């Protein structure tokens, strides 16, 4: 009897900044946790930016898919918030690198006044928004297609490291899906109502489509 597949499973280190950063995010506290959202949607919006430049140049770029928009996606039973996107999307490199970005220079200075006792909200300023996924979630899965490349899952409960492997679980056509697996003390966020008002407080000038879907299985 054979296996139905095979593949490998790469397990990395955090850069030295970035894990400093994440161990701050989850060891102290912040009130203003909400802005996790915030931070995800704008990623999805600069993921989405590139794609629709690439595009103008080479319409084939939409191929797989010609909708660029951002889909959030509560799940109660499941304890997950989801953040869909049709954006660029990420090769390995660009999910092993920083979720492909890059971390700004002043990340360090950011950090200090955070262990000075200085507020999360400008995390974004940084290239590190991403993080602040971890405000609000346990573990975090992200699963990623960029055009001419494979599906890949990424994957961290903190602790210094994260894992990719190629993705065999259901397709997506292009760009990044965000799995928040959320604390039990942070589920407010899998309220309709609450993620409303927090896209209508932060999320305001986002030029694409962001469309909330309510997950209930019968
Ligand atoms: O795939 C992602 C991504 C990472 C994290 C995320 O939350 C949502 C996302 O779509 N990005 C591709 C790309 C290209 C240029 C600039 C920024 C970005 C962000």
């Not at 912040?30 to 993921?47: G, M, Q, T």
């Not at 002043?106 to 590190?128: P, R």
């Not at 297609?145 to 490349?149: P, R």
């Given at each position: 009897?054979?296996?139905?597949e095979e593949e490998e499973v790469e397990t990395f280190?955090?850069?030295?900044?970035?894990?400093?950063?994440?161990?701050?995010?989850?060891?102290?506290?912040?009130?203003?946790?909400?802005?996790?959202?915030?931070?995800?949607?704008?990623?999805?919006?600069?993921?989405?930016?590139?794609?629709?430049?690439?595009?103008?140049?080479?319409?084939?770029?939409?191929?797989?898919?010609?909708?660029?928009?951002?889909?959030?996606?509560?799940?109660?039973?499941?304890?997950?918030?989801?953040?869909?996107?049709?954006?660029?999307?990420?090769?390995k490199?660009?999910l092993i690198?920083?979720?492909?970005?890059?971390?700004?220079?002043?990340?360090?200075?950011?950090?200090?006044?955070?262990?000075?006792?200085?507020?999360?909200?400008?995390?974004?300023?940084?290239?590190?928004?991403?993080?602040?996924?971890?405000?609000?979630?346990?573990?975090?899965t992200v699963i990623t297609?960029?055009?001419?490349?494979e599906q890949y899952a990424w994957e961290s409960?903190?602790?210094?490291s994260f894992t990719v492997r190629t993705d065999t679980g259901?397709?997506?056509?292009?760009?990044?899906?965000?799995?928040?697996?959320?604390?039990?003390?942070?589920?407010?966020?899998?309220?309709?109502?609450?993620?409303?008002?927090?896209?209508?407080?932060?999320?305001?000038?986002?030029?694409?489509?962001?469309?909330?879907?309510?997950?209930?299985?019968?």
């Open positions: 009897d054979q296996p139905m280190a955090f850069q030295a900044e970035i894990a400093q950063l994440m161990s701050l995010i989850i060891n102290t506290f912040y009130s203003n946790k909400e802005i996790f959202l915030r931070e995800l949607i704008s990623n999805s919006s600069d993921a989405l930016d590139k794609i629709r430049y690439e595009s103008l140049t080479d319409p084939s770029k939409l191929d797989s898919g010609k909708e660029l928009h951002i889909n959030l996606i509560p799940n109660k039973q499941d304890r997950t918030l989801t953040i869909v996107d049709t954006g660029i999307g990420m090769t490199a660009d690198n920083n979720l492909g970005t890059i971390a700004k220079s002043g990340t360090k200075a950011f950090m200090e006044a955070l262990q000075a006792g200085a507020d999360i909200s400008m995390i974004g300023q940084f290239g590190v928004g991403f993080y602040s996924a971890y405000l609000v979630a346990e573990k975090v297609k960029h055009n001419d490349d409960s903190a602790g210094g259901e397709p997506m056509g292009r760009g990044t899906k965000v799995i928040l697996h959320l604390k039990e003390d942070q589920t407010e966020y899998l309220e309709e109502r609450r993620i409303k008002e927090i896209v209508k407080k932060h999320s305001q000038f986002i030029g694409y489509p962001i469309t909330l879907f309510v997950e209930k299985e019968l």
